[PDB]
Predict the structure.
Amino acid sequence: YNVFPRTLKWSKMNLTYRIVNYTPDMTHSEVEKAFKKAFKVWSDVTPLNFTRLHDGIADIMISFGIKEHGDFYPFDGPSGLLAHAFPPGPNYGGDAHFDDDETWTSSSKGYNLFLVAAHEFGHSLGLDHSKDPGALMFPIYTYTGKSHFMLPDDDVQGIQSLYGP
Amino acid sequence: CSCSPVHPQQAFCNADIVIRAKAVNKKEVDSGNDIYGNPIKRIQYEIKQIKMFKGPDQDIEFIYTAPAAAVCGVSLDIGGKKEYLIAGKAEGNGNMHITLCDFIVPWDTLSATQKKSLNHRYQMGCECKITRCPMIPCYISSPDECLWMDWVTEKNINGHQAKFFACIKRSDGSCAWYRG
Ligand SMILES: [Ca+2]
Ligand SMILES: [Ca+2]
Ligand SMILES: [Zn+2]
Ligand SMILES: [Zn+2]
């Protein structure tokens, strides 16, 4: 595994998130389920817990963007960059942005929102990219298996090195 | 940062610039402040262009990338003995911008077919689409496509097709994988 400077990790175990906007590719319920599942990957193996807020300020602000979306890191249309995120901290810190010029799905087609979100949330929590193509924190997307997602050991070990099991 | 898997031909065809180069220095450059007041920096790599396979005639002397991996920042070896195959975006004359989603690999990791394909074979294939096969069964929907089967056949983006094949238009048929 690989972690960003360990000193700057989330000092509190209860974190909040908010879905700022929704891709029209899936229903609100489907988007919500994808993100809920994505956070659970991490909370299942650490003391972190996540609560979704319907409004107001949250630690992890999630949004869908097309090209220039407000920050210095514009998306690039279909394919290429799929999403990005920011390490723990104020404002942008912890936030995740998904490129809506992708087709987001709950399947093997287009790009699976849950899988990409699980990776990005890894950054939101302090993990860097892994050099192992088999790890979730590997930056190039590969559609995983057939049905049953299992957080690879390396990613478990990384996040626990930060927050404990 | 999450990136689409890409076969080298796609990378060649989609990038503004494709070069063989060596990075010799790294420097942080001030690029303003974000909406919250955080200073924005870019990393500036001073490079030596060894050869350009595609791009503007003005040689690339600088490559910019984000400081953070998490917004797709790239780290290059600045020792000066490590060569890279860099595909990326063209900025002002002599400047280039790269992200992790770009195709960037150590020159020495390239198959002989991949190195040679940079001169002309990949360009020959640009009119063909290379399509992903995330999970079987994936079909050949159209004649102008090749199906990239590396992921589902073997477990590597740089599989058999990436290393040895290009997707090029045939006479009678349209596109098909070719090893030449
Ligand atoms: Ca935040
Ligand atoms: Ca994109
Ligand atoms: Zn963004
Ligand atoms: Zn990433």
